[PDB]
Design a protein around this ligand. Sequence first.
Ligand SMILES: NC(=O)c1ccc[n+]([C@@H]2O[C@H](COP(=O)([O-])OP(=O)(O)OC[C@H]3O[C@@H](n4cnc5c(N)ncnc54)[C@H](O)[C@@H]3O)[C@@H](O)[C@H]2O)c1
Ligand SMILES: NC(=O)c1ccc[n+]([C@@H]2O[C@H](COP(=O)([O-])OP(=O)(O)OC[C@H]3O[C@@H](n4cnc5c(N)ncnc54)[C@H](O)[C@@H]3O)[C@@H](O)[C@H]2O)c1
Ligand SMILES: NC(=O)c1ccc[n+]([C@@H]2O[C@H](COP(=O)([O-])OP(=O)(O)OC[C@H]3O[C@@H](n4cnc5c(N)ncnc54)[C@H](O)[C@@H]3O)[C@@H](O)[C@H]2O)c1
Lengths: 415, 410, 410
Amino acid sequence: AENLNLFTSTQEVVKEALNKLGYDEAMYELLKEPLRLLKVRIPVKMDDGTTQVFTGYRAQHSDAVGPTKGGVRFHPMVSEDEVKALSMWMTLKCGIVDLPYGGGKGGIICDPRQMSMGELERLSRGYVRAISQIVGPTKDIPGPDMFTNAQIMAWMMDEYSRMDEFNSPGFITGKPLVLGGSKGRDRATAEGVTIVIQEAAKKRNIDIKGARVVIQGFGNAGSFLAKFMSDLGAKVIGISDAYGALHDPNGLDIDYLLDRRDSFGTVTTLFENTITNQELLELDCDILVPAAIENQITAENAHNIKATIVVEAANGPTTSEATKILTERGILLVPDVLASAGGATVSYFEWVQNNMGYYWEEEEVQEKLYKKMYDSFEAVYTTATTRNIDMRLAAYMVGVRRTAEASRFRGWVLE
Amino acid sequence: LNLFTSTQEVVKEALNKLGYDEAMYELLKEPLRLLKVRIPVKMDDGTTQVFTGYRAQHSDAVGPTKGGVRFHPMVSEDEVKALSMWMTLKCGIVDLPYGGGKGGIICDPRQMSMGELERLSRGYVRAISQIVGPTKDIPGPDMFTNAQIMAWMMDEYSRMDEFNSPGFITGKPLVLGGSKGRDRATAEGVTIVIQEAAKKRNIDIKGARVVIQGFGNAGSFLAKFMSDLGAKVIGISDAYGALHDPNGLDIDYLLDRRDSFGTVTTLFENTITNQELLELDCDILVPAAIENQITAENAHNIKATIVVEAANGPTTSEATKILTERGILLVPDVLASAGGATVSYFEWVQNNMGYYWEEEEVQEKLYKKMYDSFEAVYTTATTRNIDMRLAAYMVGVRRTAEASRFRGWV
Amino acid sequence: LNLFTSTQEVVKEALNKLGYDEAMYELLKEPLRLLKVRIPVKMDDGTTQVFTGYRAQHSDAVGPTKGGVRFHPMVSEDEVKALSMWMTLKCGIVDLPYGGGKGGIICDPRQMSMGELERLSRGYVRAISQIVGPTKDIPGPDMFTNAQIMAWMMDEYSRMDEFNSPGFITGKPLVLGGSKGRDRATAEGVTIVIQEAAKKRNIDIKGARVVIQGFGNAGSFLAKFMSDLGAKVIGISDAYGALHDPNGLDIDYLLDRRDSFGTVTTLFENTITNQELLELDCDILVPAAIENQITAENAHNIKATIVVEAANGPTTSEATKILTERGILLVPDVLASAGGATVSYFEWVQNNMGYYWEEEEVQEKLYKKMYDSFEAVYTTATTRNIDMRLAAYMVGVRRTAEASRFRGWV
Ligand SMILES: NC(=O)c1ccc[n+]([C@@H]2O[C@H](COP(=O)([O-])OP(=O)(O)OC[C@H]3O[C@@H](n4cnc5c(N)ncnc54)[C@H](O)[C@@H]3O)[C@@H](O)[C@H]2O)c1
Ligand SMILES: NC(=O)c1ccc[n+]([C@@H]2O[C@H](COP(=O)([O-])OP(=O)(O)OC[C@H]3O[C@@H](n4cnc5c(N)ncnc54)[C@H](O)[C@@H]3O)[C@@H](O)[C@H]2O)c1
Ligand SMILES: NC(=O)c1ccc[n+]([C@@H]2O[C@H](COP(=O)([O-])OP(=O)(O)OC[C@H]3O[C@@H](n4cnc5c(N)ncnc54)[C@H](O)[C@@H]3O)[C@@H](O)[C@H]2O)c1
């Protein structure tokens, strides 16, 4: 078999990152588990008047660099291991992009598609009331993640604000603009993924105009990224869905698909001639972008991948043995910790704007975002080729450095 | 020679020339709050040693108070009170929303271990935490404290608070919210004040004759900075002697041959005295050694157009008056060295937003502050026909006097 | 943890590999003599201050002891003891008729006038005169001391003798019997060891690839020397980064962009990291910056045929084993830096004769001393199949242990 546990696999790279950086075993012991993990039971009155109690998680990986940052996930597969690994990745993202953050993450075991608007609101208010003692603008700043959105952020912001007895926009990011959100929040992730595609393309000497790209997933990341790739002149040879995939060697009509895709990012069920997801990962292209879920590139298929570049818009799409197979095959892997930092970057700008009470325009957010994604790409890429290591390990090296140095400076690990 | 009563006389003469009344002096002649504490520390040998600590807050009329903490065997109450007042003047000269603060512990840090200094740093924050914080009173580094001590003090304050409060204290390491451009900021400010004094006397640096006293951290950097401006550095000096070249010294040679303790006179046979170095004919004299170097004894002998004080307190009171009525443009230390307080303030602003500037941006922001402060003091000096030191004190105190009146305290 | 006990461990392992008994380590693990004196000094204010001084004489089996005097607030009895033992090891490595000595005074020379330091210097000679002298124990400069302090101590001792005793003390001004060819003696010494290490590996220096880490005092000097001999210096660095040119970096141009802290990197920002600087493929790597740069994580990837430590402790013990296992010729810092002691010795010899050598003659003799030492350590390391750092230690202790046995002390 292969190790598919998101948590223990992430631990192993962090351990190697910290050893290559020269730290003592105690720094791996301090960073391998979140400093705080709160598990909570949340009762919600359901539309039929009965009560359901939901299990929720809030993980705070490390406090050392500043308040922890990370989204909240509503899914029936939310586990404590996933929430921790997600939380550790947010530490590394924030490090790579140099934010005064540590990593946080949250999750609630629920099926949100089976719940009404009112039930979602009461679940969201309960979650904030359950965890409020350890979160806030100066402690831990949640945000959206898949299946949670601006309306849920608005509800959670409202509930936190009523408890404080004053508006706290800085508690949570991904807010609507009228609630103190930021320009650029919707396209931030895919816009960040587009920048590392362009930078990876330059390394490999691929012209984007005419480049064959394939995208697994058609949600916020996938569908925004397809639009960006399309009117950048790339041919989006295939897009994917929780239910199937589409393939066109001329490149797909992305506008046509965006017009018919639902809020949950599914569009494949409209077509008869579908292709499987395992086929989509394997078709010949220049850029493969996994932007769906975790562990889609494994040991069973990492040899069959034909892209020259694969960039991880999604969290944890490729496994440890896949990364080693890919890098041995000469692929330019751009790890998720790098490629998706665009969403954490813009979420941080939202927070900065909330701290000052003053708000930035699109062009200013885009300007500051591009600087960060550009400079942070060179950092990880230069580290990989200078230490003769794979790109993920190098991104972990770049991302864990601030947290380790802060934990040292503060006295958490001595010597 | 008592610092504190001497500091009071500075405040009194400045409030009096500004036109404020006796009540205003009485409000400002002592800190509003002075906290004396006793900090037990578990020492590495298992005994408890108990240390005396101080935290003075002079006036918070203008904003939270600001000032560093020092660990010295000779720290006293009067020392901390006086320096908190000087911090008030320093902040106002460069127009910060800050009153003056100051702290000290009676200890010999060089005789204590790492673990003892950390435990004493933590116990200090515990002892005073009820009157300090990002919105109340912001400490910073000083004598025998550095970024690591700031880092321990911040961690302690943030644990007490149950959240990160990087704005509690300045001088932090970068990874804890420290500010880029912090190490050079004081010396860069002397560089601006030197170039701004030069324009006031229409003295082009390139080819100008400049002599600097001292060759350590401040003096090395100032001799190199003017030598690359094309200026002729005809004199530099040591604790042991001085060097004189009417054609300009080869600063890069001296720089190369100096030892790690700011000595270089010792290598040389032909050598002139420090007292003769100060009396050299030149355009810019920059004392960067030690105090009471220009006194009533040689004040009529120095023949420089411009005297910028890089050392603290190198010109005595009577010598300052002799210099001004010989037409000499004297830039006081409390203005010349205000780059360090300005960048402390920049660090605290970054902690308030949660957003951090690039070095080029801190420099840009640092330059204007110095350029602006120099002009405020220079204009007050010349409008009121006073020396620039008293004018600097006046610019230093007037915001606190204005704020105290507006808020109803007088 | 602690330097003295760590220095005891070095002497123990060397005597063990040479084959001596536990008695020889019992004789050498502490200095034969250790004099702790109290020195009263009249201060400029008229009060008296009483300072603590130390003089350590490790072993006079081979001859009079030799070692410098430092004036530092952190001087401790264990530090003076340990450094005297290091002076034995140094004097051994370069085969001097000396044993190890050292002194220290607990003071802050930064808070003392020129007159206070002179009176302290004379009071220290007075306080230890009974056990030092040209034929017993020969001091020299060190931290915060210099040729002026050596001139004062030589005068005090001569006054005490009732005749001129220049060989009491080295580092003197030339006009009092100091040596020519002294100023860059340590740096010239590294230069000799680099060339001699290069000829061992049959490497033509005149086209060799040289990487230097550090660009202050030592790095700037070594780079210009290698550049001049025809070597291509393909890398240099400072605290803020590194530069890389595969064909030669053009040192003369970089030495002109230096900023007085030894920084050149900030001006380019087409820069490489320090980590990459150290793993660049080359013939001669020279860490002349800080310490712990070559480590267990680093050492497997360094690509230089030869590594010459021009700083103290830049290679760890773990790393030292690895470079030795990979067949890299490592010159330890305790050997590469022995030129300062060698030229100290030459000053003493000239004092003994009353006859003084030209710069060229001091250089010729320095080269032969450094070549012979390099050859001796290389032969011990190669013959016993051990790393050069342990071999250096062994050459350094060998003479004292052979003399201690011969004279009956064990
Ligand atoms: N935190 C954020 O705001 C944010 C934004 C963009 C991306 N991401 C990360 O990237 C990934 C996608 O996030 P999103 O916001 O785009 O999600 P989303 O919920 O908006 O859309 C998910 C997409 O993946 C598809 N999908 C689900 N299971 C699939 C499967 N087995 N095979 C193929 N497609 C499948 C869905 O049908 C939909 O097309 C996640 O790992 C997420 O954490 C996060
Ligand atoms: N960057 C700045 O401009 C700056 C910042 C802070 C403080 N200072 C002040 O500058 C002075 C020196 O600070 P530093 O960091 O350069 O110190 P340092 O100890 O690094 O250098 C001091 C220099 O002054 C010389 N010196 C000592 N006593 C002397 C004497 N009696 N006569 C002549 N020279 C003498 C020393 O030999 C040395 O060359 C102090 O008064 C200090 O308060 C300057
Ligand atoms: N004052 C003290 O207590 C003390 C302590 C040790 C040594 N010293 C003395 O200081 C002198 C040091 O000479 P030097 O040649 O080392 O010069 P230096 O210290 O003036 O400059 C050293 C160089 O190393 C650089 N550097 C610093 N950190 C670096 C890093 N991580 N990577 C790469 N480069 C880095 C510096 O920027 C500079 O370029 C000697 O005389 C020595 O005896 C004094």
